Write a protein that binds this ligand. Structure first.
Ligand SMILES: COc1cc(/N=N/c2ccccn2)ccc1NC(=O)c1ccccc1Cl
Length: 414
């Protein structure tokens, strides 16, 4: 009885049980809220089905405390090992599936910009110089400002990760172009004239603005004050009419016609250019791998009480460390794809929060390695550890969305 341990001068059990219960309530609230408001654009935009798996994971994370603070029965040693290994595996298998898909969507998004400017500006697959005289390759990608061609080859090889002999492929030029886009988009957001326009525009019309920036630079695109304001107000037909009067249109009419037409339609029409049930099956597989590890260890080192509210089991270091390792890989993958997609604005900046969640989760899990092994109160540290990691995931991912559903029904709009 955790109440008895409180009476005696030990409040750790009762704390753990309370943390866990507030956890379950909060998860039950968040869940029933997502069911009720499933039709709205803040739940329907993301993967509704993966969230249920993430919430089950969080839920089961809180339920672990009821097998760690338990009566000495055989099955609770079985459920301890299932819960402490499978609850994070449910949350992060679902999450890594979500973040990987965001990353593939981001990659395929950057491919259109690249195809756009391949057609508009060109591409050389072997080293050349710009009109200054500095070594360049692909879509005007700068290598070095050194007169040494070897330096250019040197920095190219580093940039790609093979000996290129100064020659690359379309896909390695794409890779290089994505640095130059990110660079150009940083300049734009540092620039008070361009920043509000880029903010306003959909993905396709941002491609159009980056194109112009790539042709005339930032200070040049800031020239088009009126045209820029027309686009901000989403006045497409009038922005086209105005830009079609420019020195820009009269000096490079072929490229200008295409960029302008793209500002009108918000489509790719002017240029030559990941499932749902898949994510459940992949998430389910990634989770059965963790089950395989736990069931394997149940045969190698069968669960058994050691022999009292702290239920102590025989679980050896390999019983702890094997699932820990796999959970760690899941976390590191999640963090990797999350960070890759951190600035993706889709679904009310879902990506910004997920990145923050994963950064926290890394410091927590890495912290609780020396803490747990260095500790003589392992069942308690395990209790607070699981619940904390689960609260972080619920806190940083689900609260921000439940907030908008409940507090800001007006902003809950596509
Ligand atoms: C960070 O602590 C843990 C959290 C766990 N679940 N979190 C959850 C669970 C559900 C949803 C989100 N998050 C599971 C095991 C944990 N710890 C360990 O298994 C462990 C054991 C020994 C040494 C170090 C560690 Cl890190």
């Amino acid at each position: 009885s955790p109440v008895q341990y409180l009476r005696w001068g030990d409040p750790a059990p009762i704390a753990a049980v309370v943390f866990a219960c507030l956890g379950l309530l909060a998860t039950l609230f968040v869940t029933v809220v997502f069911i009720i408001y499933r039709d709205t654009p803040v739940v329907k935009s993301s993967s509704r089905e993966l969230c249920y798996i993430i919430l089950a994971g969080i839920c089961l994370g809180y339920l672990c405390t009821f097998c760690l603070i338990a009566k000495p029965k055989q099955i609770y040693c079985y459920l301890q090992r299932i819960g402490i290994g499978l609850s994070p595996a449910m949350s992060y298998s679902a999450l890594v599936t979500k973040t990987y898909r965001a990353a593939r969507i981001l990659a395929m998004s950057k491919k259109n910009i690249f195809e756009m400017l391949r057609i508009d500006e060109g591409l050389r697959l072997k080293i050349y110089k710009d009109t200054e005289g500095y070594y360049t390759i692909g879509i005007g990608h700068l290598l070095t400002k050194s007169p040494s061609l070897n330096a250019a080859k040197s920095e190219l090889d580093k940039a790609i990760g093979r000996n290129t002999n100064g020659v690359i492929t379309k896909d390695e030029a794409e890779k290089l172009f994505n640095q130059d886009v990110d660079a150009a988009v940083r300049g734009i957001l540092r620039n008070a004239k361009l920043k509000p326009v880029y903010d306003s525009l959909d993905a396709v019309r941002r491609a159009a603005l980056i194109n112009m920036v790539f042709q005339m630079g930032e200070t040049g695109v800031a020239g088009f004050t009126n045209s820029l304001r027309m686009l901000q107000q989403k006045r497409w037909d009038e922005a086209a009419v105005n830009l079609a009067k420019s020195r820009w249109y009269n000096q490079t009419p072929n490229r200008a016609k295409r960029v302008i037409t793209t500002f009108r339609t918000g489509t790719w029409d002017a240029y030559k250019i990941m499932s749902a049930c898949a994510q459940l099956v992949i998430a389910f597989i990634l989770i059965c791998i963790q089950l395989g590890i736990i069931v394997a260890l149940f045969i190698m080192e069968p669960p058994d009480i050691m022999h009292e509210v702290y239920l102590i089991c025989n679980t050896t270091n390999l019983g702890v460390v094997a699932p820990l390792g796999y959970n760690g890989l899941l976390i590191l993958a999640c963090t990797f794809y999350a960070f890759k997609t951190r600035n993706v604005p889709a679904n009310f900046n879902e990506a910004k929060y997920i990145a923050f969640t994963m950064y926290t989760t890394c410091i927590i899990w890495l912290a609780f390695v020396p803490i747990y092994f260095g500790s003589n109160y392992k069942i308690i540290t395990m209790c607070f550890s699981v619940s904390l990691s689960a609260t972080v995931a619920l806190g940083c991912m689900f609260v921000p969305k439940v907030y908008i559903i409940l507090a800001k029904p007006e902003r809950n709009v596509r």
